[PDB]
Amino acid sequence: GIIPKKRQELMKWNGWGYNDSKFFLNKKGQLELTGKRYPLSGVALPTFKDWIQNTFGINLTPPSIVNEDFLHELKKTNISYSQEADDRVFRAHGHCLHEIFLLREGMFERIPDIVLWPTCHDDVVKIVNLACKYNLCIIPIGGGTSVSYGLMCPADETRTIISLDTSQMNRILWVDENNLTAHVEAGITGQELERQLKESGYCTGHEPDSLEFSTVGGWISTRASGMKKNIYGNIEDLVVHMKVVTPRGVIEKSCQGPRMSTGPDIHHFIMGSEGTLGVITEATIKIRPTPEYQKYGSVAFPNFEQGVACLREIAKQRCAPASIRLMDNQQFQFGHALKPQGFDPNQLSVATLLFEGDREKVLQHEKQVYDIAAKFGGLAAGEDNGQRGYLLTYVIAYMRDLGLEYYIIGESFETSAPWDRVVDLCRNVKERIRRECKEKGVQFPPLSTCRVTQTYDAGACIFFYFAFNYRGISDPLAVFEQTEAAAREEILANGGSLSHHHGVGKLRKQWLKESISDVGFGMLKSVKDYVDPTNIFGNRNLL
Amino acid sequence: GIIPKKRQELMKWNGWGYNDSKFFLNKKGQLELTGKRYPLSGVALPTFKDWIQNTFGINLDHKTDTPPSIVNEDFLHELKKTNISYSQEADDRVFRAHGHCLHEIFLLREGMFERIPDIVLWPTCHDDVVKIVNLACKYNLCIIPIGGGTSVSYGLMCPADETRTIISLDTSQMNRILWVDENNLTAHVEAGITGQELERQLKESGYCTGHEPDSLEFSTVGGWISTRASGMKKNIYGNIEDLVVHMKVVTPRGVIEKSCQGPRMSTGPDIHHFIMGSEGTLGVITEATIKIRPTPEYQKYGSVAFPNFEQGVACLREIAKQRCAPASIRLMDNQQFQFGHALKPQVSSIFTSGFDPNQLSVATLLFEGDREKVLQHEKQVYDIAAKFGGLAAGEDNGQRGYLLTYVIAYMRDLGLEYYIIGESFETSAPWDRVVDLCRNVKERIRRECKEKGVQFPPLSTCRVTQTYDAGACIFFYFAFNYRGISDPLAVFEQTEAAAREEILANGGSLSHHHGVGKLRKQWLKESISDVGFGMLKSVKDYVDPTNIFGNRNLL
């Protein structure tokens, strides 16, 4: 649960997650996740092979450049550090498909020169002051799970780049049971956070799909969103307090009030700042008693549009359960192919549901939901089919490394949009992808899929998967990366946002000024130029 | 509900609200509000005089030019070409030279302002605002935007040593609903529309915002966004920062707006939060998209009495812990309970003055939404309450407390005719500090007054007015009879500063909703750290580099 210093002992240098977990074919020729870590671990998936085959038409380093008298002064603090190639390479990237290619195939252009491992707030203060004194460049890293190029080192950064690794700065500092808050160190992962809260009878309920590795500091930095936000809030509702070390000095409010009116909220200057302003070291987060009961469910709809209209109605009545998701037909069948052991089934769409709270309330709420669904032609599809798409939630990123071994490339991307744009966006965006792949010479129709993943009063988060069999293609990355950018253009033309939770990093920089206005961009820059005049925090995300 | 241009035709020039609405003594010597505007209007309040006498020690017998307009003639020339409506009349300028602080109100009654705006403009749309801002760059002018003029933090006071021509940029003619989107449940509005007129207009469509601050008859969308306003039913509808989905802001550097109308994004720090709470320092909010909701099918009032205030707080804490706070829940201390009881129709005899009626606190409750849910919910709340000693005090006591809300501000003016000065002030605090903060702040107040030579013990009262997961908003009221005190405004001002210091030392914030204005400037840096303060200043220096927006709030 604590990320160890040498990450490659536990985690894959060249892909997602733990060394001991990959898809392989078992002794019966069926796909299976190796290892003992998950629910799905060791569970044969008899129809997954057949699904992959039908869907995709397949069968089956630079030296360290670091100052000698900086290094000297660092030796004084006994802060742990490393200049080893694997250590720097492990931290030179996140989890974009571009990045995960290179790794396996070539080498990166720039990697950190030196990794540092602070264990507390004061360590981070010292590091930041050394960086000021000796003109060095810092890139913070927590889980390393960025999907937005947020950790890529600018290839023209000629300063020494410090990788400031927050993974040893990872304690629950205090739990305040009267105020239901917990003060934690920013390097704690979501797993280690919940596991510890759970022993006192509390949780945070913040469940991004990367919680095994993503950290509190990361969440704040990227404006992270979790599967159960309908109950617990997204990151900007969970955080009541934070402490940030910048070159200019330390940021922190003096009181733990729940809500204030003392000028523009400075917390909001830091959430989303994507590593560009300083290091978030500590944060206070709301907690909640561990829910009494959990119930899964699912609903089948005659088509995707009926499903969307139902999710709209559920949001309009303000009775979304802990989680509700609507998959289109493709993503359904994906799902249904992964089972252990009326309607037209080619347009048929499926919502999955998660209820949690008092057992009394769950089954009451559940009934209100299926009654609403029934007005749209919804029909209960059973708890097991619901319980699946959610026990399957944390495997999906192991699947990418399995596609790559068979010449399949895919990646996800997401947006949020007002309710009245959701249907046209899904359609036009899934169709632009298909159009671009054919025009770029992809030989097989891509996987082009969407789901509705979060509901809000004023609209929805939409999630896309895109993948294709690249064989016979000259330059597969370029095609892919051109098709993704075209999908983004389709997204923005259909009134969707630049991003709902992934952030901007360096992947989506080119669209920011248009998204937030020129003066908006100027405002961000003006904070940057004040907090960090000498651009110590030089990952160049956002701006 | 639209503010017409010459406000003093309708509103008091020297205090709260409407001309037609003030307290007076009726033909049988009972206090009574004039006019026909409120539910209490024209209703004799037979025990209100007694309560005032018991509480303040007065009889209720003993009662109690402008700077020239300096404006560049060329500016004026270009201003006429735009056909934007304007005034240099002294009463338009003085009306817009203040908000509703005691201190301001007092000068109004007793003297003249040091500095008042030099010209009042009334833009009717966004492009008018762009024009004005451009004219202020060109002619080196200062702009102070005003909506309702209901600020209570000095937010509208013109700094005395501002030497540039000051435009009072009044937004009240900028008041249309531009579209109501029933698909997305949003409404796009001009920022000068009042709470009253917004809700009246949405209601005709079957919708509401449910944003209900006590100043809603006058306060504006732009105002709310500027001050980070909180309304009475936030538990259901959210505070301003939850309600606003979109905004357009004209600043000297250009116009801020996002390019989409999505519910939630991750595109860097959220610039909407750079403008929320900006108190007129950065530019003009011209238009906003706000969430709306179907008009609630059903409302119910209720009330609960508790053995004491502590028990009341523990119950609110539990209700918040179970996440079942209704539309509105407010807990009043014994003094406020007694106050409310004195606002009732039965006429007492002049020869008369298991719960103790002098420690007992009362929670007022509002539930709204679907009949079925309301009712279920109401049960759940009383079931909880009953474990803290709570007894139902009846639907009429709840209804009264909430009907009373919009008249309390007319009592301040009544107080002032009889030598009583009073002012409210608020904070937010974690749960575990609430009971102590209330006990200590009230006791600081009573000690400062006595030390300052106040004769009769002051009214010092609180209520817990909002619940959150992490804490509560606490609202205080403070008043005393100043009669026979030398410099009464000084004694008052210093006692309020002392109370603020007690608040901060008991783990409370600088403000929950009133904001910082010019009144709390000295505490801000400590509140947000120096670097925090520094970031604010850098956005100010970038968006308004010549300080056109010169009201000098916050920084």
Ligand SMILES: Cc1cc2nc3c(=O)[nH]c(=O)nc-3n(C[C@H](O)[C@H](O)[C@H](O)COP(=O)(O)OP(=O)(O)OC[C@H]3O[C@@H](n4cnc5c(N)ncnc54)[C@H](O)[C@@H]3O)c2cc1C
């Ligand atoms: C398989 C997978 C599933 C995912 N699921 C979700 C999801 O459900 N919801 C969601 O929101 N995201 C999701 N993400 C994206 C990602 O996990 C989040 O953006 C997460 O917040 C990043 O946290 P991290 O600790 O891994 O940060 P990192 O990847 O280490 O860094 C993220 C950015 O923040 C900066 N940073 C990191 N720590 C600090 C610090 N303490 N101080 C200052 N800056 C810092 C870095 O410089 C970088 O720019 C997913 C990603 C993957 C690969």
Ligand SMILES: Cc1cc2nc3c(=O)[nH]c(=O)nc-3n(C[C@H](O)[C@H](O)[C@H](O)COP(=O)(O)OP(=O)(O)OC[C@H]3O[C@@H](n4cnc5c(N)ncnc54)[C@H](O)[C@@H]3O)c2cc1C
């Ligand atoms: C009796 C009474 C009850 C109150 N109750 C509450 C309450 O329940 N909740 C609460 O939060 N507040 C309350 N207040 C405080 C006040 O009404 C709120 O702060 C409200 O938001 C102010 O709105 P307004 O339109 O009157 O703004 P104004 O007083 O006109 O201006 C407020 C500030 O915003 C700036 N400003 C105004 N319009 C714009 C604009 N369009 N663009 C940029 N800047 C602008 C002004 O320069 C000023 O600094 C109350 C006040 C009184 C007197």
Ligand SMILES: [Cl-]
């Ligand atoms: Cl994700």
Ligand SMILES: [Cl-]
């Ligand atoms: Cl108020």
